[PDB]
Structure formats: structure tokens, C-alpha cells
Design a protein around this ligand. Structure first.
Ligand SMILES: Cc1cccc(Cl)c1NC(=O)c1cnc(Nc2cc(Br)cc(C(=O)NC3CCNCC3)c2)s1
Length: 292
């Protein structure tokens, strides 16, 4: 984990404000002053607690363990000087859910499926590294200028044995239940198979351009529907094979869900033979329009 000297970091614009600190777009001078790259910079403001420090630096320490095209890349940290900083590659199009909501209907099916393949490859890498994400959702995916999607949001509570915060978000809040598999909701059994359930929800988010899973249903109403066997209906214009794959991610019995390797393989097969994506699942209309 590379310690960066503050003289190598310039902050150009705020892109996110927080209670704990801010996130900036900036530049990082690297390679002994011979290179310069755009970066995102997150700070931890003075007065942070020991827990806030361990969580903050812990996320960087985990990110530094990974080297994959579909996982956000860590440049390094500033810990010896204040404010402390985590510095990553800069993802020009921000969070995937917001990106899709601002680009509604503008991508092809093949582009959407390609985004899902990248996310699945990142998740396959994480799962094979024995990292369970626990909060996989489009809001935790970032998108670059070239439409590459990368998994982000990481924390020590996911790796430490019997962490008292293992069932919370990386901020200490409640993991939004509508992305979470039933056995993780009810028994706190988080595994890569519960991440697969979450990935299925991400597939639905992508194919709907960022719709809210289960629409207006409350959390208890979502739990009621899932445990009754209800599942999200097919998005509009969604390939049958893609909807079948998300349905398999949502099998109640976790051993019946695909592994991330299966997901990557299936998505690859569909992209390579794109006529396979022309068979569309029937979209259930929610409004009767009677016309001649
Ligand atoms: C710095 C850091 C520390 C710890 C964990 C992580 Cl994942 C990070 N890195 C980051 O948060 C980020 C990396 N890239 C980011 N890109 C980003 C985020 C946000 Br908010 C907004 C924008 C951004 O300004 N996006 C444009 C402007 C608005 N519409 C189109 C997208 C970019 S945030």
C-alpha cells in the first residue's frame, strides 16, 4: 500500500461532500515526477475516531489487495499528513445507477450485457479471493469514460472473523434489504452465493436503466413478496436468456444459484453469438391501452 506525499496531490473540484470528509477530482504526480494522472481523492477530516480511521484505512488496505480490470484501482494513501486521503483512479461517469438514470434508453442491449459481464468478472475475482462484498448494488459500481464498470465499496468488516459490524454497510447503516438474499437478511449468512443474488438485482437495475427494485414496496413488503416466491418481472426489451439468468440468481436455495464463474461464462457465450439475445422475454404491460 503506497504512501503518497502531499506534494504529489492537487485537488481540482469537489464531487461529493460528506459529514466525515469529501471526495474530490484531482491529479496525482507519480513515477518520480515524470507522470501525471487524474484521480479521485477521499479525505478524513480532523477529529475522526479510531473506528473511523480503521474503517477508512481498512477500505484502502483491501482495495490494495486487488488487481483486476473490473475492480477500482487504488493509487495509494496519505496517512502521515492531515487530512488523511485515499487516492484511486478517477471514474469519469460516476456511479452506475445514476449514470443509467441519466442515460435512459440510450444504450444497446449488447452494451448493457457487456456492462454486466464486466461486473460479473470483477465479482468472480472477488469471490475467488474469498472476499464477500455484502452490499453489491449499482450504486456501488463506478463507470469510466469508455463504459467499463468496476466494483467499489469495500471494508474490513467483511473479512475480519466474527466482526460485530459484518451485517452493516461500510458506513455502519443497515444494508438495504432489497438487494440482499433471504438467508443473509434472516440468518446473517453472507457468502458469495448471497452476492450472486445481489448480482441478479444488479442485472435488473442495468436492464431497466436504474429502476428502483420492487418500486414502492416497503422493505417488509419486499420480504413478504420474496418469501412468497414473487420475483421481479422482466425489464422491457430484455433478452429471454438474460431474464432467465437473473431468475437463477434469485433461487431461494443458495446452492441452486449459479457461481460467478457460471455467470461470466454464460454472458460471454451470449455476447459472442448475439443472435441469442434477439429472443426477448415477454414484458408484462402494467396498463391496458385499448385502440383500433
Ligand atoms: C477516492 C476513493 C476512496 C475510496 C473508495 C473509492 Cl471508490 C474512491 N473513489 C471514488 O470514490 C471515486 C472514483 N471515481 C469517482 N467518480 C465520480 C464520482 C462522482 Br460522485 C461523480 C463523478 C462525476 O463527477 N461524474 C460526472 C459528472 C456528473 N454527471 C456525469 C458524471 C465521478 S468517485
Amino acid at each position: 500500500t503506497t504512501e503518497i506525499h502531499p506534494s504529489c496531490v492537487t485537488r481540482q473540484k469537489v464531487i461529493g461532500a460528506g459529514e466525515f470528509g469529501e471526495v474530490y477530482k484531482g491529479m496525482l504526480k507519480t513515477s518520480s515526477g515524470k507522470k501525471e494522472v487524474p484521480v479521485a481523492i477521499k479525505t478524513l477530516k480532523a477529529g475522526y475516531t479510531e473506528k473511523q480511521r480503521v474503517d477508512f484505512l481498512g477500505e484502502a488496505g483491501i482495495m490494495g489487495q486487488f488487481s483486476h480490470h473490473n475492480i477500482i484501482r487504488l493509487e495509494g494513501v496519505i496517512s502521515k499528513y492531515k487530512p488523511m486521503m485515499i487516492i484511486t483512479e478517477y471514474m469519469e461517469n460516476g456511479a452506475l445507477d445514476k449514470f443509467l438514470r441519466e442515460k435512459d434508453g440510450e444504450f444497446s442491449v449488447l452494451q448493457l450485457v457487456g456492462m454486466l459481464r464486466g461486473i460479473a468478472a470483477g465479482m468472480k475475482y472477488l469471490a475467488n479471493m474469498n472476499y464477500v462484498h455484502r452490499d453489491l448494488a449499482a450504486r456501488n459500481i463506478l463507470v469510466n469514460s469508455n463504459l467499463v464498470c468496476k466494483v467499489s465499496d469495500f471494508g474490513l468488516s467483511r473479512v475480519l472473523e466474527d466482526d460485530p459490524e459484518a451485517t452493516y454497510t461500510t458506513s455502519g447503516g443497515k444494508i438495504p434489504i432489497r438487494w440482499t438474499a433471504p438467508e443473509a437478511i434472516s440468518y446473517r449468512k453472507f457468502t458469495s452465493a448471497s452476492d450472486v443474488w445481489s448480482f441478479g438485482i444488479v442485472m435488473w437495475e442495468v436492464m431497466t436503466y436504474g429502476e428502483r427494485p420492487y418500486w414502492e414496496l416497503s422493505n417488509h413488503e419486499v420480504m413478504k413478496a420474496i418469501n412468497d416466491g414473487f420475483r421481479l418481472p422482466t425489464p422491457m426489451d430484455c433478452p429471454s436468456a438474460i431474464y432467465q439468468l437473473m431468475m437463477q440468481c434469485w433461487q431461494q436455495e443458495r446452492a441452486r444459484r449459479p457461481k460467478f464463474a457460471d455467470i461470466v461464462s454464460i454472458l460471454d457465450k451470449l455476447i459472442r453469438a448475439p443472435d441469442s439475445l434477439k429472443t426477448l422475454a415477454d414484458f408484462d404491460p402494467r396498463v391496458s391501452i385499448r385502440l383500433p
